[PDB]
């Protein structure tokens, strides 16, 4: 199975610089052209840059808005792809995907297309400062029915990338993640879970909130 794992994404000040990496496996890295593709929040896909194989002299090309500021490179001995990003503007804020080009044109056509995609890494270009989240439990105030819905409020963080899990992910079937909204300066969201009433509060239910940009992890047990 082809795998592509990007890293290096994070918060950077406007006019700053940042370097993305991608690790590949499950195919012969040095025979393929490679790309980066991006997606601004709530927008569509935009091709960013391409680097060909060594047989094609590692030829590079760039999207208009990034030419002369971004450099794409590869290290075939480690199956790695990189994107050096300089003079960053707010409009470079996006999810960046490492992407493997289609194979031999004889079987797949001369036309460019994108065979395998990574899951992506988030880049945020902003002058705002990293701020960890406050995590408040949402527990019924109340008559009990056959199910019960609990939640966690996650408030006051920047930049945008928190994961909320329930009982270390052992509770996944009825989890709702509400998109984060800018307050502004700062993000807020909540997450909810529904369990059978017999399950809670007899058994323990904890929501775990991670905020990589600030290396913060908070686990909140829900009181009744």
């Amino acid at each position: 199975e082809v795998q592509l794992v990007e890293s290096g994404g994070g918060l950077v000040q406007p006019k700053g610089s940042l370097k993305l990496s991608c690790a590949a496996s499950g195919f012969t890295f040095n025979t393929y052209a490679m790309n980066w593709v991006r997606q601004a929040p709530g927008k569509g896909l935009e091709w960013v840059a391409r680097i060909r194989s060594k047989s094609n002299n590692y030829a590079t090309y760039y999207a208009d808005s990034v030419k002369d500021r971004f450099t794409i490179s590869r290290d075939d001995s480690q199956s790695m792809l990189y994107l050096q990003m300089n003079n960053l503007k707010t409009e470079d804020t996006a999810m960046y995907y490492c992407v493997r080009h289609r194979g031999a044109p004889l079987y797949y056509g001369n036309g460019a297309w994108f065979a395998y995609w990574g899951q992506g890494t988030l880049v945020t270009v902003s002058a705002a400062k990293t701020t960890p989240p406050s995590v408040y439990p949402l527990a019924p105030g109340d008559t009990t029915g056959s199910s019960v819905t609990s939640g966690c409020l996650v408030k006051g963080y920047f930049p945008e990338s928190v994961t909320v899990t329930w009982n270390s992910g052992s509770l996944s079937s009825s989890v709702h993640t509400f998109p984060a909204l800018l307050q502004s300066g700062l993000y807020t969201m909540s997450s909810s879970v529904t369990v059978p009433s017999s399950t809670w509060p007899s058994e323990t239910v904890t929501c775990s909130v991670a905020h990589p940009a600030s290396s913060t992890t908070v686990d909140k047990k829900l009181e009744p």
Partner: protein, 212 residues
Amino acid sequence: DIQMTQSTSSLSASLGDRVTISCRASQDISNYLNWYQQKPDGTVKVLIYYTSRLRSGVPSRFSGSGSGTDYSLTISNLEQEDIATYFCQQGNTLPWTFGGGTKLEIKRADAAPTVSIFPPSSEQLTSGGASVVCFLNNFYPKDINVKWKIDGSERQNGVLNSWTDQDSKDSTYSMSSTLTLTKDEYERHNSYTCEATHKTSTSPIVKSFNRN
């Protein structure tokens, strides 16, 4: 650059229906037109390449056609797992460009929301804040109205609403309504009420608590 234009940004259809999504290029692209699917979780995969060639491992209910500047993706019978955004992409000439995407919603039977209200937490109260939270969960269709009443009186200010994506498993939506107040503002009232009006019922679903 070649501008790629998709028919709509959004459409809605029933399980079992045939759906077609169109793509137009600003210049002839010699059949080098490819289609991608992006799941709500962000994951992207190729469906069709070179106009009509089905990607190995992709269900045959997906097909493509067209020539010159006009192209189409067709899903012959719509399945649950097809909730996603669909993108076309020209690979004729650099820079390679994408259409703006077409979001696909699945139709289903109407469903009433389950409503839950939550007072501000103690932890939050001590920090000088007061957020009252209301979840409206697993309803269909998407259109819904939520009113906040404080001691019988409607409030507009400081109310923030947020909808989920259509959920991939059961095609319902959920939404949160968060009323943010100062602690001393919260402390001057007693009854807090969240009311949801939805086409599934003439009567609002009302959820309520007293600060005591």
